[PDB]
Amino acid sequence: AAAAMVGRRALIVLAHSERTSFNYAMKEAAAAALKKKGWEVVESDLYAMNFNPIISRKDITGKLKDPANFQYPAESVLAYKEGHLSPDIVAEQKKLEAADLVIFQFPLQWFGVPAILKGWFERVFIGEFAYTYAAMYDKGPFRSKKAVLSITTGGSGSMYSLQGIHGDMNVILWPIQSGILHFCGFQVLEPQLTYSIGHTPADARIQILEGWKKRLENIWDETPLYFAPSSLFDLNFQAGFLMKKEVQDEEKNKKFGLSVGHHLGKSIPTDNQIKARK
Amino acid sequence: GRRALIVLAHSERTSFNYAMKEAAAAALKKKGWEVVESDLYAMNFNPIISRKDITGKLKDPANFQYPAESVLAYKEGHLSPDIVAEQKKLEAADLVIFQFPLQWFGVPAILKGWFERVFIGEFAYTYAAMYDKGPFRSKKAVLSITTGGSGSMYSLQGIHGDMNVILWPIQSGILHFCGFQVLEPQLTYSIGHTPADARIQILEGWKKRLENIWDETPLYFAPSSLFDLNFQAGFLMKKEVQDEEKNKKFGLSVGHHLGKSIPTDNQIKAR
Ligand SMILES: Cc1cc2nc3c(=O)[nH]c(=O)nc-3n(C[C@H](O)[C@H](O)[C@H](O)COP(=O)(O)OP(=O)(O)OC[C@H]3O[C@@H](n4cnc5c(N)ncnc54)[C@H](O)[C@@H]3O)c2cc1C
Ligand SMILES: Cc1cc2nc3c(=O)[nH]c(=O)nc-3n(C[C@H](O)[C@H](O)[C@H](O)COP(=O)(O)OP(=O)(O)OC[C@H]3O[C@@H](n4cnc5c(N)ncnc54)[C@H](O)[C@@H]3O)c2cc1C
Ligand SMILES: NC(=O)c1ccc[n+]([C@@H]2O[C@H](COP(=O)([O-])OP(=O)(O)OC[C@H]3O[C@@H](n4cnc5c(N)ncnc54)[C@H](O)[C@@H]3O)[C@@H](O)[C@H]2O)c1
Ligand SMILES: NC(=O)c1ccc[n+]([C@@H]2O[C@H](COP(=O)([O-])OP(=O)(O)OC[C@H]3O[C@@H](n4cnc5c(N)ncnc54)[C@H](O)[C@@H]3O)[C@@H](O)[C@H]2O)c1
């Protein structure tokens, strides 16, 4: 009936302290659904792990190159290559290497990810492992993997609409989806947005769980979000990593920009960071 | 005698970030400001929200909810004392300066956590008082950021895309949301490839700016009065205001682009 997805691995990263939370419920739902379709599922429950989110010298267990002028980016890359990274970092890196699908489950906090997840990015997404300056965006190491955000908010969807007090949600997601995930190569799927979960009745919450589960059955066949391909740009320091001139000329006449970040002073394509286009 | 709080998020005293903090403190003191600091790494500050932040009796320990529990604790005064000490510095401060390196297109984890544990409901925001009506409307804030990448990379045509979009969640979502008037950010691009003689010039320029910082015009955000501030209306833009804007070519701000063009450098330069 569905002899598929049998070879495939999934990592679920959760950033909530309480097992009584709807965030925890969504993580359980995701794991169940994926297992049922024959995925292997690994988890990182950052609060349960008591994960340490602060970068420091202690992340390098070997010999620093220049302890007088300590620079986390350079020192962390050397340590990755020589294998004297702190073992909590390495364990997470091995889960990522193995995973084909990565799901991030968290509550929106101050228009962003929780501190503990931010720190996970900071300590685990090391140079050479997750990105290089030669291989950015679509050429990056994780180009064979897919990622998706599943977010809960306290505020209602109207508040994050084009005319809402808080403003467009597409703008809020951009730094995360483009700046962190796509930067390392991930194909980014449509975010799962659960608005105003605190004022949602029980019957509706169950529908949401059921809908999440249903989505996950075919998650791998979805079309990803649109980001400008790197090939539109001159990727060297002399050109300034600017958009190629021929591409500027092709776009001179169009009404819409390419993406939220590449709006080009024009209109932002509707729901660029929320819905795929095919 | 006005008061200033400088929040720093860098671990190394050898860093240009540390240099900029020292420069800021010197300049402000010279002009007769009182200067308080939060060096988050030096303080070994704890950035993770937990039950431990409430020292008293939880309202509902079976179904723990940080937003509700933190607000009760603020009102009854059983917040963890590390949180309270920071809150007292904020209350006193007229000017707040945030000094940090851009990390993953955002603030460092340790500063994010500072926001999460210190900007508690009732203290920093309510629901009645959002944005320009918020508790900190009498105070001014400014970001001072360093990046490794060059400014061309964050231009309209750069690989990384518009810097105005990157700053919006911080300046609007965190700072303006609580009432702060937000001043033009101090952006130091490609600090890694800047020599010592140039860095000292930059420090000197930072210092020069700070002598008149209080007289500057703040960034533009859509006033709250353009909106229907109740749950039934959905906090949407009022109909009359939608009609007045229907024909204009530019939107109001980065977040309130309204499907039109974003006013140039909305989050970087004042009017
Ligand atoms: C520091 C901070 C910053 C914040 N910033 C923002 C912000 O910028 N924007 C914003 O919109 N919000 C913000 N919030 C609010 C926050 O995003 C919400 O509290 C969060 O999304 C709630 O998710 P939860 O899983 O914790 O819900 P809970 O309140 O724990 O759960 C919601 C409801 O679902 C019920 N439930 C749990 N499990 C199940 C189940 N299996 N089946 C059915 N019902 C179930 C619960 O019992 C409860 O009734 C912020 C909160 C904090 C603490
Ligand atoms: C996890 C992580 C994520 C990152 N993500 C991004 C990203 O998304 N985008 C981005 O653009 N960058 C990113 N970076 C890079 C980061 O922003 C830069 O490395 C940072 O801005 C460097 O600033 P610094 O103060 O540490 O100075 P450094 O350049 O690291 O070192 C300071 C130098 O200044 C010198 N100096 C100090 N004081 C003085 C003085 N008074 N006079 C003269 N010289 C002085 C010191 O001697 C030293 O040589 C990231 C880095 C990390 C670790
Ligand atoms: N933008 C931000 O930075 C930010 C940060 C935090 C929260 N928020 C806001 O959080 C809201 C989500 O709803 P909420 O978390 O405020 O819900 P809430 O806590 O106000 O839920 C209210 C319900 O809980 C009941 N209740 C009983 N005792 C209570 C108590 N001690 N405290 C609170 N409620 C009690 C009320 O009677 C009512 O039924 C959104 O409006 C969102 O904007 C925004
Ligand atoms: N996260 C990011 O966005 C990002 C991206 C790329 C690189 N980085 C980091 O920062 C570094 C990027 O380099 P950078 O931007 O600091 O400097 P750079 O290496 O690009 O400096 C350019 C060099 O050419 C010269 N030069 C600079 N501008 C010029 C111009 N307009 N015309 C002619 N010559 C010019 C300079 O004197 C310098 O020697 C990388 O080494 C990496 O560590 C971060």
Curated annotation (Swiss-Prot), chain A:
Keywords: Cytoplasm, FAD, Flavoprotein, Isopeptide bond, NAD, NADP, Oxidoreductase, Phosphoprotein, Ubl conjugation. InterPro entries: Flavodoxin_fold, Flavoprotein-like_sf, NAD(P)H_dehydrogenase_qn. Substrate binds at residues 130-132. There is a cross-link at residues 254-255 (Glycyl lysine isopeptide (Lys-Gly) (interchain with G-Cter in SUMO2)). Pfam families: Flavodoxin_2 (PF02525). FAD binds at residues 16, 22-23, 71, 108-111, 152-155, 160, 205. The keyword Glycosyltransferase does not apply. Its EC number is 1.6.5.2. Residues 229-278 are annotated as: Important for apoenzyme conformational stability. Its cofactor is FAD. GO terms for cellular component: cytoplasm; cytosol; nucleus; synapse. Flavin-containing quinone reductase that catalyzes two-electron reduction of quinones to hydroquinones using either NADH or NADPH as electron donors. In a ping-pong kinetic mechanism, the electrons are sequentially transferred from NAD(P)H to flavin cofactor and then from reduced flavin to the quinone, bypassing the formation of semiquinone and reactive oxygen species. Regulates cellular redox state primarily through quinone detoxification. Reduces components of plasma membrane redox system such as coenzyme Q and vitamin quinones, producing antioxidant hydroquinone forms. Quinone reductase accepts electrons from both NADH and NADPH with equal efficiency. Homodimer. Interacts with PDLIM4 isoform 2; this interaction stabilizes PDLIM4 isoform 2 in response to oxidative stress and protects it from ubiquitin-independent degradation by the core 20S proteasome. Interacts with TP73 (via SAM domain); this interaction is NADH-dependent, stabilizes TP73 in response to oxidative stress and protects it from ubiquitin-independent degradation by the 20S proteasome. Interacts with TP53; this interaction is NADH-dependent, stabilizes TP53 in response to oxidative stress and protects it from ubiquitin-independent degradation by the 20S proteasome. This is NAD(P)H dehydrogenase [quinone] 1. The lineage of its organism: Eukaryota, Metazoa, Chordata, Craniata, Vertebrata. The gene is NQO1.
